[PDB]
Amino acid sequence: NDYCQHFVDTGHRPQNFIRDVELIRLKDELIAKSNTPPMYLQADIEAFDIRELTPKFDVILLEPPLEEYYREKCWTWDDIMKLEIDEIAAPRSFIFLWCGSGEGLDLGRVCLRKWGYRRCEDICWIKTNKNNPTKTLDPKAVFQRTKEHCLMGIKGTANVDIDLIITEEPEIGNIEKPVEIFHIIEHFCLGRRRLHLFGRDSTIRPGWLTVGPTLTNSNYNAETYASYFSAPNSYLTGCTEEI
């Protein structure tokens, strides 16, 4: 059966018909044990000197609010590419950049290279439409856009997850990204200094520092934050038992 033809016939996206979206590890308890408490800071990142965010981060999750998401401030790739991300990334560290589905697939790669990362994975958020089997197509678009990409970059020197996330297309005006990206990220056991830029009250999470203009409250303190990684907790993977 041709699922692309079906979509042309019925409006049901081909990914509506993927199913399964043995053996147990559940190591996530290791992660959750070593998790730092959630810290969060309201800040206008356009006007915020990101260098005041210390120490250097092992993982940065960057979710700039793109104009294409809305169809209180949209960020262009011009704004994003000028963030001084490399000034807060650890010499060995990881980035996850939400790029949307348009020009960001190119300009996000430029950003990654600009900040010193090589792209090592391309994670696709595939959006099903089971609940209502076509939006205003971007003028350059050739096809209907039913997915978004999160780019994973690495700078500096086992697999549980796949590079796909499959969830139902959220309500129009809902800009939230699937919480599953946090599960993929934490399953890598990368380092415990994890920063989420442009997070919201609703994304605050144990083990992460969340910075965004729409946070209603802040509890960030640099020395307090630094303390969570002071010896003997320095180079913990975040997937180890407590010392």
Binding site: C4, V142, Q144, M152, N159, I162
Partner: protein, 195 residues
């Protein structure tokens, strides 16, 4: 001339100018990421720019060719305007480095100002089962036909099971040469009087 056509050859050397202009180019390159590999400079030098005036290019990429494919795209005169994702399943509609890979990517680029294409009929996700080696899902031909009905199109690095009506297929695992279009039969004679 509608029915399938093909040219067993080395794509590095065939003078593709004999073929005329196409509404759609598709290519599954053997990226250097061995067998019948092209190097990045051999890829870069492919004379893609002569195959189209206005139309679309469909370029399969993996690994570091996600970056190199974008480079070739722009070098060849194209802007990437879409990126098709083939989600791979096995029979039971079940999804078959740092992460296991469930998908292959096909960059979509545009050159010129195409007219009379049916944009937005299909979406950018293909769900199909994996088949033989580097055998891309047949759904793609249906997607491209609906997007550009009737027009002439060309596929690079294809195999015998890729020949399709309205397509000229190029590749070195094809069987000989088989051209039906009068114009292209003429030019092929003047350019290669002896095969």
């Amino acid at each position: 001339l509608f029915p399938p056509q093909w040219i067993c050859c080395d794509i590095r050397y065939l003078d593709v100018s004999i073929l005329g202009k196409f509404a759609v180019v598709m290519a599954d390159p053997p990226w250097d990421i061995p067998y019948g590999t092209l190097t990045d400079d051999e890829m870069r030098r492919l004379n893609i720019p002569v195959l189209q005036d206005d139309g679309f290019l469909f370029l399969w990429v993996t690994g570091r060719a996600m970056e190199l494919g974008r480079e070739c795209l722009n070098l060849w005169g194209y802007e990437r305007v879409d990126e098709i994702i083939w989600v791979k399943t096995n029979q039971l509609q079940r999804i078959i480095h740092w992460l296991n890979h469930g998908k292959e990517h096909c960059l979509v680029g545009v050159k010129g100002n195409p007219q009379g294409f049916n944009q937005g009929l299909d979406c950018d996700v293909i769900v199909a089962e994996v088949r033989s080696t580097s055998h891309k899902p047949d759904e793609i031909y249906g997607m491209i036909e609906r997007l550009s009905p009737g027009t002439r199109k060309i596929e690079l690095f294809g195999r015998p099971h890729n020949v399709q009506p309205n397509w000229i297929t190029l590749g070195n695992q094809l069987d000989g040469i088989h051209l039906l279009d009068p114009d292209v039969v003429a030019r092929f004679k003047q350019r290669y009087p002896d095969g």
